[PDB]
Amino acid sequence: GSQDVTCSLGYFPCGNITKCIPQFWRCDGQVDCDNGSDEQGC
Ligand SMILES: [Ca+2]
DSSP states (O other), rough: OOOOOOOOOTOOOSSSSSOOOEESSSSSSSHHHSSSSGOOOO
């Protein structure tokens, strides 16, 4: 399959680091992410 990054069911990546985080912190308004990608348009 050729892959490295991996997350859980209710989780999603951020940006460069691709840090996986819980949907609970999606489109909310926090820099919790590693690259603040969660707050880049939402
Ligand atoms: Ca967040």
